[PDB]
TrEMBL record, chains D, F:
It comes from Borreliella burgdorferi (strain ATCC 35210 / DSM 4680 / CIP 102532 / B31) (Borrelia burgdorferi). This is Uncharacterized protein.
Length: 161, 151, 309, 37, 309, 37
């Protein structure tokens, strides 16, 4: 898929709850001194936008591919499809923003984990979580893709259950 | 409180330039970089100079309170009483400064963990003590540490 | 140019005698904005902003601040060019047909160029008004044999993604049922933050005759006005009657932020430079006009159709 | 360039069409100024 | 300054395109008085006089005269400073993104600084209006995840020591019960000698829809207006509908002697001098605003809440 | 000092902010003058 996604016959119809857009600005709270890196991504394997990515050093360049929490390099916050370039916030930096999830029913304050597809899921799935992820809001569906506001702050000392 | 405002009748002699920085009112850190991340958060209680954890629930936005362990989120380095806010350095950012210790047993070269009250106690590891625990007043002990994360 | 183009001189002289189109009464002055185009398509981009989180309190030192995001939406509009041809008397032949206080062949229905152009322009303006009100182009009272038009070319009645209500044939004369459907459509209306705006209602003569009936010492028109005032923040509600409609009721706000008319600046009739001439006294002229340019937001127009069968 | 201006003298058909469009716009503005509801 | 600060020049040039806040319609011109304070607290002292005894008759010789006493009252108001950050294109880079009839990246949702500031200011003004009307700060439709605010920072709907009325969930659709509660609140209202003043009522869209129903050829709105005129010395009574309210009715006078808005003169959005810059074409800018400053005398606001569950 | 005046040339950012505040106050006054309930 894509982020921008088209001519319309008519325009689409308060200030509240207007941020529920797939192409919304990922950082709920931004900050200067946040490190952002550029990498290449596979244009036919998996679309890394708003997903946890890992570094795959290929024979021609270092790419980023959707990955699990065990081998996560960071979070892909934006993509330039013209150059097929992914922008990554390293895991060493804090993040507070909207990410792609696969569970349409997640409550606030729950512990979360990133799966092999770079997707937010409930931490009770069984895999030992290695990152501190907490749900700051209930998951919402855009009609279909599920998004959720999360706070990610570093790695977890001892893997939980 | 960080700055207990009390009126005095006589000026206090303050001329010596040594042993003048180890005090409860000295906010911030001993060494600070321009590229350090600081976040302002609503707080409950008084988590000043302590490890802070983010507590999430009329529904209100999540706040921060004194704590540690698996729920540790950051360190409170400054506080604003009027706005009821706290400046927090996240756990992903290293910090060097004086923090509240549980007791005087902490010495140099000691690995320290933030307890459930946000105080540093001897042994995941969180900090390495740089100086001995010093009693500012009553049971308040301040120890210089260099926070590096969680093991 | 006027020393050489008699037809252009006559058009400039008689251009003031053409009456203003009646479609201007259906829009506010701010809703209409001309564009420079004759035939083709044009893309309009609308920008919006939203808050991502609660505002950040500025106290002591802080580097993390809440953000404000932006978004865009693109809408395509189509414009079509249409032409008409009319016959008239040659300029040099007028003196041979200037009769007593009138010029032209009564037997052969031949007219001077100025009068012919004025009448043709009036007819074309009427056709343009019909197209704007209905969204279809037809010269028949039945409304059939419609000229095929391009997509993204709609009127106020056939605009997609609006609140459509249908009154069954069994209740074609039940004003209570008609008003129930109107209330349902008004409830389904979505104005958002632009609800404080005047409203416009367009009805057919049969609907007006039913409306002026007593409410079952109040009238259905008064009840409808009160209902619309209940939603438009107690602002002006205008009611108009049009013979171009048939058992249709149109309700829409007169706000430029929801509905915008962006016609081509050549939409109104304009003479063509080409003039057909021969050895006889009869000449031909062409008039051009442009159709298209209505834009509206989703769920802001209420269209009620009273089925007759 | 408007046909309502007696001082205006067009040079070519393009200027004539521009003047016609300007005159139509001015007439619409005048109608909206004089309109009463 | 304008020779060096392109952002300041653009802000000055486009500052006039931001529409006025809608909160101005809820207050009289004399009720609003700006103050000079960004963040902190301000103490306002109100003085009053009273008669100690009956006046003394001046006749022949007398030295003992009746006295007039004085009293004071101190009220503390809190003002909070908040900030927002938004991204925008760079001035030296706008030339490479100036497309036909528009400027900015459609794909990247990047806008010129002027348009971005205008949209952000509009959003912040909407948030300020919501805070003024309600007294809470939130960006969700459910009204949750509210930002905790300082004490002595109240809106019209959450001002303490006022008349509060509750309509039971079983009587949520009974306009007679709602009007009985309104009459009880009006009776409990205390205006003293300042009763001769215009009154303002703010209602939700549902209450607005219910008001136009026939009274049980008279309307509930007319009956309410007559009742309010019975108490306000038959002054003007204004009715407003706001989408920011939900099943709430606000009634309060427009007298500056009872309710006063003393906002900071920096309350409306103001650009910040700090602009984040790097080697790329994207820059960040900050907007500041101030909240707080509503003062009201005791028992002069009627707040009716219709419970839904 | 307001941004409405063409002769007004701000010297610094403090003067610019003061002019913005004065412009906002003048706009509020104009809105109240033009408002007819």
């Amino acid at each position: 898929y894509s982020k921008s996604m088209i001519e319309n016959k008519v325009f689409s119809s308060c200030f509240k709850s207007k941020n529920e857009r797939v192409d919304a600005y990922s950082f709920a709270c931004s900050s200067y001194t946040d490190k952002i890196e550029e990498y290449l991504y596979d244009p036919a394997n998996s679309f890394p936008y708003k997903r946890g990515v890992k570094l795959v050093p290929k024979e021609n360049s270092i790419y980023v591919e959707v990955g699990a929490d065990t081998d996560m390099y960071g979070i892909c916050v934006d993509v330039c499809e013209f150059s097929c370039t992914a922008y990554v916030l390293p895991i060493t930096n804090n993040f507070e923003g909207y990410l792609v999830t696969r569970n349409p029913s997640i409550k606030i304050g729950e512990i979360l984990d990133i799966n092999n597809n770079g997707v937010i899921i409930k931490a009770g799935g069984g895999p030992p979580t290695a990152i501190n992820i907490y749900a700051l809001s209930d998951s919402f569906t855009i009609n279909s893709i599920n998004l959720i506001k999360v706070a990610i702050f570093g790695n977890r000392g001892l893997e939980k259950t | 409180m960080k700055n207990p405002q009390h009126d005095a009748s006589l000026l206090s002699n303050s001329n010596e330039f040594r042993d003048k920085n180890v005090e409860f009112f000295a906010s911030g850190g001993t060494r600070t970089s321009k590229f350090d991340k600081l976040e302002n958060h609503p707080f409950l209680g008084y988590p000043y100079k302590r490890g802070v954890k983010r507590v999430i629930q009329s529904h209100y936005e999540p706040h921060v309170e004194a704590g540690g362990g698996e729920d540790l989120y950051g360190i409170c380095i400054d506080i604003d009483e009027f706005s009821k806010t706290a400046t927090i350095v996240p756990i992903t950012n290293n910090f060097e400064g004086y923090l509240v210790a549980k007791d005087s047993t902490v010495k140099v070269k000691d690995k320290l963990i933030f307890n459930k009250d946000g105080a540093l106690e001897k042994v995941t590891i969180n900090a390495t003590a740089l100086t001995d625990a010093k009693q500012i007043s009553n049971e308040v002990y301040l120890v210089k540490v260099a926070v590096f994360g969680n093991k | 140019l006027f020393d050489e183009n008699y037809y252009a001189k006559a058009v400039a002289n008689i251009i003031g005698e053409v009456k203003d189109p009646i479609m201007y009464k259906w829009f506010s002055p701010d809703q209409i904005e001309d564009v420079d185009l004759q035939m083709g398509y044009q893309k309009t981009v609308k920008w919006d902003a939203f808050l991502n989180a609660n505002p950040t309190t500025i106290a002591n030192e802080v580097n993390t601040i809440s953000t404000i995001g932006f978004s865009s939406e693109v809408v395509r509009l189509n414009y079509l060019k249409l032409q008409y041809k009319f016959r008239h008397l040659k300029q040099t032949s007028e003196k041979f047909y200037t009769s007593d206080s009138y010029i032209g062949d009564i037997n052969n229905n031949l007219l001077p160029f100025a009068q012919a152009y004025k009448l043709a322009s009036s007819e074309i303006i009427k056709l343009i008004n019909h197209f704007v009100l209905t969204g279809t182009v037809s010269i028949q009272k039945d409304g059939k044999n419609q000229k095929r038009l391009l997509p993204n070319m709609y009127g106020l009645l056939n605009m997609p993604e609006q609140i459509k209500e249908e009154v069954a044939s069994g209740d074609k004369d039940k004003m209570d049922k008609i008003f129930e459907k109107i209330e349902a459509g008004l409830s389904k209306l979505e104005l958002g933050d632009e609800f404080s705006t005047p409203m416009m209602v367009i009805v057919d003569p049969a609907t007006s005759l039913k409306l002026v009936k007593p409410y079952a010492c109040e009238k259905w028109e008064d009840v409808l006005i009160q209902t619309i005032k209940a939603i438009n923040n107690r602002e002006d509600v205008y009611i108009e009657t049009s013979n171009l409609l048939k058992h249709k009721i149109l309700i829409y706000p007169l706000n430029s932020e929801l509905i915008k008319f962006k016609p081509s600046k050549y939409m109104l009739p304009t003479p063509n430079e080409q003039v057909d001439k021969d050895s006889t006294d009869v000449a031909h002229s062409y008039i051009d006009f442009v159709l298209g340019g209505l834009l509206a937001t989703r769920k802001t127009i209420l269209q009620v159709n009273i089925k007759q069968s | 360039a408007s046909l309502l201006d007696s001082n205006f003298v067009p040079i070519n058909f393009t200027e004539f069409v521009q003047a016609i469009s300007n005159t139509y716009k001015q007439r619409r503005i005048q109608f909206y100024e004089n309109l009463k509801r």
